[PDB]
Scaffold this active site. Structure first.
Site, short mmCIF file in Angstrom:
data_model
loop_
_atom_site.label_atom_id
_atom_site.label_comp_id
_atom_site.label_asym_id
_atom_site.label_seq_id
_atom_site.Cartn_x
_atom_site.Cartn_y
_atom_site.Cartn_z
N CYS A 3 0.78 -1.15 0.00
CA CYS A 3 0.00 0.00 0.00
C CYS A 3 0.88 1.29 0.00
O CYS A 3 2.13 1.26 0.08
CB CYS A 3 -0.88 -0.03 1.29
N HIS B 17 3.07 1.89 11.91
CA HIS B 17 1.93 1.66 12.84
C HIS B 17 1.68 2.84 13.71
O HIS B 17 0.55 2.95 14.23
CB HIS B 17 2.21 0.37 13.75
N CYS C 291 2.07 5.92 8.98
CA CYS C 291 1.24 6.13 7.77
C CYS C 291 0.41 7.38 8.00
O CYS C 291 -0.09 7.55 9.07
CB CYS C 291 0.29 4.91 7.47
N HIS D 192 -2.07 -4.64 19.72
CA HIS D 192 -1.46 -4.34 18.42
C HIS D 192 -0.78 -2.96 18.51
O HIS D 192 -1.33 -2.07 19.17
CB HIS D 192 -2.54 -4.38 17.34
N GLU E 22 -0.52 -0.44 16.54
CA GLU E 22 -1.34 0.71 16.06
C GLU E 22 -2.37 1.10 17.15
O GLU E 22 -2.64 2.28 17.37
CB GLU E 22 -2.08 0.35 14.75
N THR F 54 -7.07 0.82 11.44
CA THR F 54 -7.17 1.11 9.97
C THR F 54 -7.23 -0.27 9.21
O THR F 54 -7.50 -0.29 8.02
CB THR F 54 -5.90 1.86 9.44
N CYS G 194 -8.67 1.85 6.21
CA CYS G 194 -8.05 2.58 5.14
C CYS G 194 -8.43 1.99 3.76
O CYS G 194 -8.97 0.88 3.67
CB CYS G 194 -6.54 2.58 5.28
N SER H 268 1.12 -9.68 10.87
CA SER H 268 0.38 -8.62 10.06
C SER H 268 -1.14 -8.76 10.24
O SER H 268 -1.74 -9.74 9.74
CB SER H 268 0.77 -8.70 8.57
N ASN I 37 -3.47 -6.87 8.87
CA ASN I 37 -4.30 -6.75 7.65
C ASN I 37 -4.18 -8.08 6.84
O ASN I 37 -5.16 -8.55 6.21
CB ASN I 37 -3.92 -5.54 6.83
O1 LIG Z 1 -0.75 -0.33 10.86
C1 LIG Z 1 -1.17 0.00 9.64
C2 LIG Z 1 -0.69 -0.77 8.58
C3 LIG Z 1 0.80 -0.90 8.23
C4 LIG Z 1 1.24 -1.95 7.16
O2 LIG Z 1 0.89 -3.32 7.35
P1 LIG Z 1 1.48 -4.21 8.54
O3 LIG Z 1 1.30 -5.63 8.10
O4 LIG Z 1 2.97 -3.77 8.86
O5 LIG Z 1 0.67 -3.68 9.85
P2 LIG Z 1 -0.72 -4.30 10.36
O6 LIG Z 1 -1.60 -4.78 9.33
O7 LIG Z 1 -1.18 -3.10 11.11
O8 LIG Z 1 -0.34 -5.40 11.49
S1 SF4 Z 2 -3.23 2.75 7.22
FE1 SF4 Z 2 -3.54 1.45 5.36
S2 SF4 Z 2 -2.35 2.57 3.67
FE2 SF4 Z 2 -1.53 3.20 5.76
S3 SF4 Z 2 0.19 1.72 6.16
FE3 SF4 Z 2 -1.83 0.96 7.20
S4 SF4 Z 2 -2.58 -0.61 5.46
FE4 SF4 Z 2 -1.11 0.84 4.47
#
Ligand SMILES: O=CCCCOP(=O)(O)OP(=O)(O)O
Ligand code: SF4
Length: 309
Positions: A12, A74, A96, A124, A126, A167, A197, A225, A227
């Site tokens: 992304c 995060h 982000c 988590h 974030e 997100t 997001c 991860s 997401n």
């Molecule tokens: O935290 C927002 C998304 C950042 C990018 O994906 P990542 O796999 O590192 O983080 P996650 O999906 O928050 O665990």
């Molecule tokens: S908020 Fe969404 S666009 Fe931003 S790093 Fe996380 S997955 Fe990627």
């Protein structure tokens, strides 16, 4: 065996920025470059950057005076940002923007002393960073993960309440939670839908379309991860066998034996090379040319800070 590829998949806009922030810092200043938490939750990206001289830490007390420090995609709590601020560090922030957007709202609610509810998964980074934007004792900041959580939450003043989201959540599950919040707290204020997001929404929509066609879905992404796990979960809920794998070596032959159609996607933190290698391994097990599905166009890019090139 037909190999189908989800679209959109993989990086992304936030993840591309955050990795570029670390690589550019390494190129401009040299090793070491300290990073608080894995920049993104991908083992390939993280091992890569470690071998190039980034040192990944959990606490600012692990970081030497004079050092360059980069916060991960995060995000980080006000307490962390201030601990970094109070020490002798040059800080670049790879949070982000789409995380920062939610941070600013929780900060708003805090300054007002009005209570806020975050939807997200305990522990988590974030969620720790977002919860960590609220500090006013006169209000309150609450975490809910499910409708049952909402059903048990009590707040001080439900006439002044707002909500925000992580997100990277399940679009469908978050919708259940929001329905519960609005029933329990009729005056609660939020965004039009949620803070999920564009990239999480799109990759879920893409994996639904993939799982419709494929018997088996492989999601490229690391265990931690959020997401990426949501993609595998969505496919499984549609009754398809789904696996979250770091790389092509994780593929077990039984998973794809006698399968006529296999689907592949990737989480927002998984580089495209990993997907290419997965396809290569499925070709060894009988797959043909990988066919990409039509998908929703993504056109968002987030630039690194000017200071980093
Ligand atoms: O935290 C927002 C998304 C950042 C990018 O994906 P990542 O796999 O590192 O983080 P996650 O999906 O928050 O665990
Ligand atoms: S908020 Fe969404 S666009 Fe931003 S790093 Fe996380 S997955 Fe990627």
């Amino acid at each position: 065996m037909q190999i189908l590829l989800a679209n959109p998949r993989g990086f992304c806009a936030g993840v591309d920025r955050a990795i570029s922030i670390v690589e550019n810092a390494l190129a401009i200043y040299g090793a070491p470059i300290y990073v608080r938490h894995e920049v993104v939750h991908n083992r390939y990206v993280v091992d890569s950057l470690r071998e190039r001289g980034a040192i990944f830490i959990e606490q600012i007390s692990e970081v030497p005076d004079g050092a360059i420090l980069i916060f991960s995609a995060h995000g980080v709590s006000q307490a962390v940002r201030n601990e970094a601020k109070s020490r002798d560090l040059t800080v670049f922030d790879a949070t982000c923007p789409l995380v920062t957007k939610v941070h600013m709202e929780v900060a708003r609610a805090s300054r007002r002393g009005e209570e806020s509810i975050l939807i997200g998964h305990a522990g988590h980074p974030e969620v720790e960073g977002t919860m960590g934007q609220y500090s006013n004792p006169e209000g309150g900041m609450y975490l809910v993960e499910s409708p049952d959580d909402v059903w048990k939450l009590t707040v001080k003043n439900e006439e002044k309440l707002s909500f925000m989201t992580q997100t990277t959540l399940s679009v469908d599950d978050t919708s259940d939670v929001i329905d519960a919040l609005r029933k329990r707290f009729p005056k609660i204020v939020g965004p039009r839908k949620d803070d999920i997001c564009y990239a999480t929404t799109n990759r879920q929509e893409a994996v639904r379309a993939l799982a419709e066609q494929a018997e088996v879905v492989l999601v490229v992404g690391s265990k931690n991860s959020s997401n990426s796990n949501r993609l595998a979960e969505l496919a499984q809920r549609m009754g398809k066998r789904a696996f979250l794998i770091d790389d092509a070596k994780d593929i077990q032959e039984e998973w794809v034996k006698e399968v006529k159609c296999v689907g592949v996607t990737a989480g927002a933190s998984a580089p495209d090379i990993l997907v290419q290698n997965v396809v290569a391994r499925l070709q060894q097990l009988g797959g043909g040319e990988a066919i990409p599905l039509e998908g929703r166009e993504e056109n968002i890019v987030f630039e690194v800070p000017k200071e980093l090139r």
